[PDB]
Enzyme design. Sequence first.
Site, PDB file in Angstrom:
ATOM      1  CD  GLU A   1      -1.627  -2.211   2.053  1.00 13.77           C
ATOM      2  OE1 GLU A   1      -0.640  -2.203   2.818  1.00 13.77           O
ATOM      3  OE2 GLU A   1      -2.338  -3.217   1.858  1.00 13.77           O
TER       4      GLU A   1
ATOM      5  N   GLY B   1      -2.626   4.723  -3.231  1.00 16.79           N
ATOM      6  CA  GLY B   1      -3.011   3.572  -4.009  1.00 16.79           C
ATOM      7  C   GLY B   1      -2.615   2.259  -3.393  1.00 16.79           C
TER       8      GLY B   1
ATOM      9  CG  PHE C   1       5.450  -8.267 -12.103  1.00 14.71           C
ATOM     10  CD1 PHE C   1       6.237  -9.410 -11.992  1.00 14.71           C
ATOM     11  CD2 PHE C   1       4.791  -7.806 -10.965  1.00 14.71           C
ATOM     12  CE1 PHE C   1       6.352 -10.063 -10.765  1.00 14.71           C
ATOM     13  CE2 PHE C   1       4.906  -8.456  -9.750  1.00 14.71           C
ATOM     14  CZ  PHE C   1       5.688  -9.589  -9.645  1.00 14.71           C
TER      15      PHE C   1
ATOM     16  CG  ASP D   1       7.535   8.651  -3.151  1.00 17.07           C
ATOM     17  OD1 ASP D   1       6.643   7.805  -3.409  1.00 17.07           O
ATOM     18  OD2 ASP D   1       7.971   8.856  -2.009  1.00 17.07           O
TER      19      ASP D   1
ATOM     20  CG  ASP E   1       4.881   4.871  -6.451  1.00 22.95           C
ATOM     21  OD1 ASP E   1       3.852   5.090  -7.123  1.00 22.95           O
ATOM     22  OD2 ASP E   1       4.909   4.982  -5.203  1.00 22.95           O
TER      23      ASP E   1
HETATM   24  N1  LIG Z   1       6.143  -2.510 -11.424  1.00 23.45           N
HETATM   25  C1  LIG Z   1       6.112  -2.974 -10.221  1.00 23.45           C
HETATM   26  N2  LIG Z   1       6.449  -4.289  -9.940  1.00 23.45           N
HETATM   27  C2  LIG Z   1       6.350  -4.535  -8.639  1.00 23.45           C
HETATM   28  N3  LIG Z   1       6.634  -5.738  -8.164  1.00 23.45           N
HETATM   29  C3  LIG Z   1       7.022  -6.094  -6.926  1.00 23.45           C
HETATM   30  C4  LIG Z   1       7.113  -7.486  -6.641  1.00 23.45           C
HETATM   31  C5  LIG Z   1       7.538  -7.939  -5.368  1.00 23.45           C
HETATM   32  C6  LIG Z   1       7.873  -7.004  -4.366  1.00 23.45           C
HETATM   33  S1  LIG Z   1       8.447  -7.560  -2.789  1.00 23.45           S
HETATM   34  N4  LIG Z   1       7.841  -6.625  -1.564  1.00 23.45           N
HETATM   35  O1  LIG Z   1       9.878  -7.394  -2.825  1.00 23.45           O
HETATM   36  O2  LIG Z   1       8.087  -8.946  -2.589  1.00 23.45           O
HETATM   37  C7  LIG Z   1       7.784  -5.619  -4.628  1.00 23.45           C
HETATM   38  C8  LIG Z   1       7.365  -5.172  -5.896  1.00 23.45           C
HETATM   39  S2  LIG Z   1       5.823  -3.195  -7.689  1.00 23.45           S
HETATM   40  C9  LIG Z   1       5.758  -2.191  -9.117  1.00 23.45           C
HETATM   41  C10 LIG Z   1       5.426  -0.834  -9.137  1.00 23.45           C
HETATM   42  O3  LIG Z   1       5.358  -0.219 -10.214  1.00 23.45           O
HETATM   43  C11 LIG Z   1       5.293  -0.081  -7.950  1.00 23.45           C
HETATM   44  C12 LIG Z   1       6.389  -0.017  -7.033  1.00 23.45           C
HETATM   45  C13 LIG Z   1       6.297   0.742  -5.847  1.00 23.45           C
HETATM   46  C14 LIG Z   1       5.122   1.453  -5.564  1.00 23.45           C
HETATM   47  C15 LIG Z   1       4.028   1.406  -6.451  1.00 23.45           C
HETATM   48  C16 LIG Z   1       4.087   0.650  -7.641  1.00 23.45           C
HETATM   49  N5  LIG Z   1       3.057   0.654  -8.416  1.00 23.45           N
HETATM   50  O4  LIG Z   1       2.341   1.740  -8.516  1.00 23.45           O
HETATM   51  O5  LIG Z   1       2.715  -0.404  -9.109  1.00 23.45           O
END
Ligand SMILES: Nc1nc(Nc2ccc(S(N)(=O)=O)cc2)sc1C(=O)c1ccccc1[N+](=O)[O-]
Length: 304
Positions: free
Chosen positions: A18, A22, A88, A133, A151
């Site tokens: 979170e 969003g 992703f 950010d 982000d």
């Molecule tokens: N593209 C993308 N992929 C992700 N995968 C992911 C998979 C696993 C983990 S984790 N905790 O290491 O297991 C973390 C991220 S997040 C992300 C984002 O673009 C994103 C990133 C930060 C904030 C908001 C967004 N957002 O708006 O989609």
Amino acid sequence: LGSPEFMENFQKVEKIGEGTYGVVYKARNKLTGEVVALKKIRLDTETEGVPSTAIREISLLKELNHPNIVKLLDVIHTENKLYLVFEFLHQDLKKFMDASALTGIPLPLIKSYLFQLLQGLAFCHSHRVLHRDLKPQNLLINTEGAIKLADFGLARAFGVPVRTYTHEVVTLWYRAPEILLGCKYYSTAVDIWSLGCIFAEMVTRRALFPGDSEIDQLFRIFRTLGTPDEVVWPGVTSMPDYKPSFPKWARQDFSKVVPPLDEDGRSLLSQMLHYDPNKRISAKAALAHPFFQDVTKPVPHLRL
Ligand SMILES: Nc1nc(Nc2ccc(S(N)(=O)=O)cc2)sc1C(=O)c1ccccc1[N+](=O)[O-]
């Protein structure tokens, strides 16, 4: 307005996390098998709806084209929600640093990641785009050794704040001092400050300035870098939130701050954390730093 094709084809596989405005999910296309990250923003519909200014900013971000920036694939407005659809990646830097508690992170990988992030930032800055950010959870890594900026922040937020999000104070940890002291317009230097804090965090595996409030954030910075004055930061004493009553701490040497980082790395870090935004190193000048003379692209040992 409804977007039924997207909504029926994509199924949420799991919630990633979170943020202030969003909720982020991993989603998988029922049809193809494509996986994406989705940021779901709830719209106010009473006061904002989808602001035109926000749409223009998002459109500009969607046009950003660089290997070290997460690709925004689509923007979908459905019902009272706006979904941002992203390329992703499998893990963020916070999880990677936590997973590295018993092993540490090899210096060559820290150097490769910092170099890549500086390339993404130099590119953005050259196109008049600030990230605003930067924090570990907004830096994403893949198995091929890449790290990408995710982000990006907007000049003006929108949507209904997420009530289940309780980590807003973390954003303060990476905030530049000029912001905490009240500057109105952010310069590209704010991203270099955040990245400097992140560089120190990769090296030590602990946040550099984990403040618990805006004033505590400022005081933690002062305790390490010394309370700024007119000598090191011309004009600081005239900033909106500067107070003559601030305690006066003397500066500490970086050798105590990021052990056991080498002299090249410490020199670069010190330039990224200069108080004066006018003197803080640019992303481009940072790429030219001697620390990067032997940079390579190693691969991480991701466990997913
Ligand atoms: N593209 C993308 N992929 C992700 N995968 C992911 C998979 C696993 C983990 S984790 N905790 O290491 O297991 C973390 C991220 S997040 C992300 C984002 O673009 C994103 C990133 C930060 C904030 C908001 C967004 N957002 O708006 O989609």
